Amino acid sequence: ATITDPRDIILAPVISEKSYGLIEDNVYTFVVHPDSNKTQIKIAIEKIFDVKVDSVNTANRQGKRKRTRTGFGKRKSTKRAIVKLAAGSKPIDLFGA
Amino acid sequence: GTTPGELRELTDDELKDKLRESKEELFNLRFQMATGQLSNNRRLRTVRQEIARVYTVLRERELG
Amino acid sequence: AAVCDICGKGPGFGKSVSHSHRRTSRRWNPNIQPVRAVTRPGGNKQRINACTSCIKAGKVSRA
RNA sequence: ACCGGGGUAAGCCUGUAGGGAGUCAGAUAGGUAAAUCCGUCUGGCAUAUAUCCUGAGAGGUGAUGCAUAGCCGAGUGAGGCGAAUUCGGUGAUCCUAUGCUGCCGAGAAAAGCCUCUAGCGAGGACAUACACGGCCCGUACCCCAAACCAACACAGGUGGU
RNA sequence: AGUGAGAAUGCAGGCAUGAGUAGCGAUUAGGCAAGUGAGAACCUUGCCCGCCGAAAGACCAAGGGUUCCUGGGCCAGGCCAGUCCGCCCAGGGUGAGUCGGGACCUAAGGCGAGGCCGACAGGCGUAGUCGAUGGACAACGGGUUGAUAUUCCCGUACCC
RNA sequence: GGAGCUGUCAACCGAGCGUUGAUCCGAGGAUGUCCGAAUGGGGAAACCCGGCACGAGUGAUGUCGUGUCACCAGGCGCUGAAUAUAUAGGCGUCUGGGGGGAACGCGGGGAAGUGAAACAUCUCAGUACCCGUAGGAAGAGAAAACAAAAUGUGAUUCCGUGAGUAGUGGCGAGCGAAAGCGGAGGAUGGCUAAACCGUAUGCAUGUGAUACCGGGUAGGGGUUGUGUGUGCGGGGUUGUGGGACCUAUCUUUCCGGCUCUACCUGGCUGGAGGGCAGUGAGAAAAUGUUGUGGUUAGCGGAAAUGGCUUGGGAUGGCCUGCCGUAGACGGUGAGAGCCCGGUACGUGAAAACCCGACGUCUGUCUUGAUGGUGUUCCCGAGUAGCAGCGGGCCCGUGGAAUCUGCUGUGAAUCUGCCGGGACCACCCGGUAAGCCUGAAUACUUCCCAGUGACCGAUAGCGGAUUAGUACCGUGAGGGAA
Ligand SMILES: [Zn+2]
């Protein structure tokens, strides 16, 4: 049988200056499974971090297309979720900062 | 890693709980590596093979 | 109108030979006739295509 | 004398210019069944600036907010204060307008919405307050051009506001 | 015997002659001071001058696909040079209940259960089901980033 | 299997595993996103939207998993419109199909350039191509055959001759057999229909009794009396014609119920020894043991550290030994039997599959064979034959036989019918209109092992390098260095 776990939908966080600036404002950015949806991300985040989430926003980003000696490559395309926590505001200490 | 021989010595309940722990640890390791604080890279591979082994023994136990 | 719904008779192919002995292709079609035939003496008729040979042999029954 | 300001939306109130419309009662299956609905036929009362609908715009609120001409100091650069805002003229190819008046060449469909019964029904209706759910794809950048069609960083071509 | 090339306006590769010759792609036009730098007519800043201004200004659709921003580079490309670039490398960047589409509706047309027709292959087509360039349906002003904003934030609304 | 390993371009960094057996090789399983016949519905393939059932999760809607839901065909069950019998149609459930594949097969449709020094008959050519369909091969196959007076062959297929012959041909260009003879393989193999019995059943009906089993004695009055059709089981598979009837002779087990019922005489059916066959064409589905039988990984495997010399290096030269069932081929710093992988020659299977063998098991014969004598019935029907128009045969319509398509016409059951190149007579051969069948033969997408008086980078595959890639084209497609 298959054991469904909310953690199989959240892959990794996004480490960047824009993400950190949002982090300061209690908005966390994750890289999620490409065929997820906002409600599913909401439920998974609440279960995983035992916190109350206000809203989620998603965006799809196509992979860059690089030159090589062999020919043309193409990196993996990703979907991101920008997740905002409620006024309760318990930080995600496991984000690693 | 934990041997399949000692993996077959548990019931479906503890097998599922161990699978849940494996999935959680994989989550934490992925976040650790993304933040760049994971020195031992092979933890990811070992936990992945562990999840696979637990699934395999579960399927075999169901079948025969 | 060239295949029989009973015996599967089909058209035959050949050549039409002229006086200068020019040969062009043609078809020998079956004499296929529309019949409103019955399956049982009850009296409900269905329309099918049967060649004249099948009607001669009594393979289809009008009733 | 000269130079610079002489601002601010959706929505929610109100319902003006303009445009359109009679109302009630009875009978009747024509509308695949049924209809109180729609047609049809009879009558009664109506010509009212009466009523109802639609409706540009002016006015209030939104706005104790935002924004702004200016004035200050700082220096990787961060930040603060902030005046008056009335009256006219001109004036759209935009709005009323899916309007009105002419004309012959006589100018989509379905969904939606309203109404009518057929049919379900012991629960159902409305108001207020609180707490929640709002899915998938695009979103960078060029777009009369060295980023599109033209073999070119090409005097050509490219629909709309 | 795949055995002998000098020619088939023969085929492929390399290189001459023309020749350091023609051109260097409009009808606007550049100048000076300073800076960076090994190197500057072309890159940056300042002050001038000139040109478009129903455009050579601003915002989209089709199309393109990372060309966008930050840091770096200077042997290829740029009809010259280049410290610059739409070029090369790494990293980052696209946030929607209300915008444009689907989950709503159909036109022309396409496919088409059964079906009819046709030696076979197949042709049409009903019920259906798709198909916008059209119908219906709820958001406006201000601010912020190096790159997004009717999407984020503030104020104030609307619809299931 | 045994000491390193974490595929490679292709390293560098960072981390670990392994004698408690890793990486690696073989076999069997598990998982297997989305597209694609694509099949829940839609669609611009790889992306949008669902229904139902069971679970998960929220305060509930939202949300998530796991199954299932296309169409058609065929069985089975239910229902049966206009409409009465009914039928079409509807509903439910089980079983199949759909698409792909390099060549080879079979069956159909079917060109033109070209040649004829023009061109139409003819050729190219039944080729190119296209359509439907298989199988590991396919097709054909068991005489309605050849032959020619021989007291001759004896299913089919394929190979060599016959033979570039007889012939055929605007008698032009060209086309072109068969009999016989020599081989390969052998299975001169097997079942069915009909005449007659029995039984079951559908449809019609009864001098409803002297008709329904063989005789006689008898009982009742239906093995319904009778027709008819259909299914099944016997019985019959043939050419010196054969068979069903009727009819004498000898006869290789026991028991029971049955020839409308009992008694003596003729028939049918089960059970016990015994025989013969079986995964096959002659019927099919299983289950055990066994074979140092095979396939899919491997392992072992003799003999030089030899001397001098040249050299960066010996595997070169000179000189010594040794192995050889091994002096095949490669590598190693230059020509190596003795350094390495190997080679000759032997060994190895847990498991899966493939072959055989012996058995359970199945079927069939045993209520059975024989040699004889004389008559009725049967021996494959819209078929053969004939005519019209065509195709194909050496044969181009010719005197045109044999085979075959469409349209008409349309026979007999053995002193019958068909073939012996028009036709007729006689003799000869065979027995059509039912069906199965191995081997000899054809081919290689793919896998393993080898070989070359084949190429050696403008060659050889288009492709030794990013290859059906880059690039070109809207597309089919073209296509490098
Ligand atoms: Zn017929």
Side-chain angles (χ1 to χ4, degrees), chain A residues 60-72:
Chain A
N60 303 351
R61 197 97 75 65
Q62 323 294 10
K64 306 181 109 182
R65 214 180 60 101
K66 314 300 257 174
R67 289 221 303 282
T68 36
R69 190 179 190 183
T70 306
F72 253 60

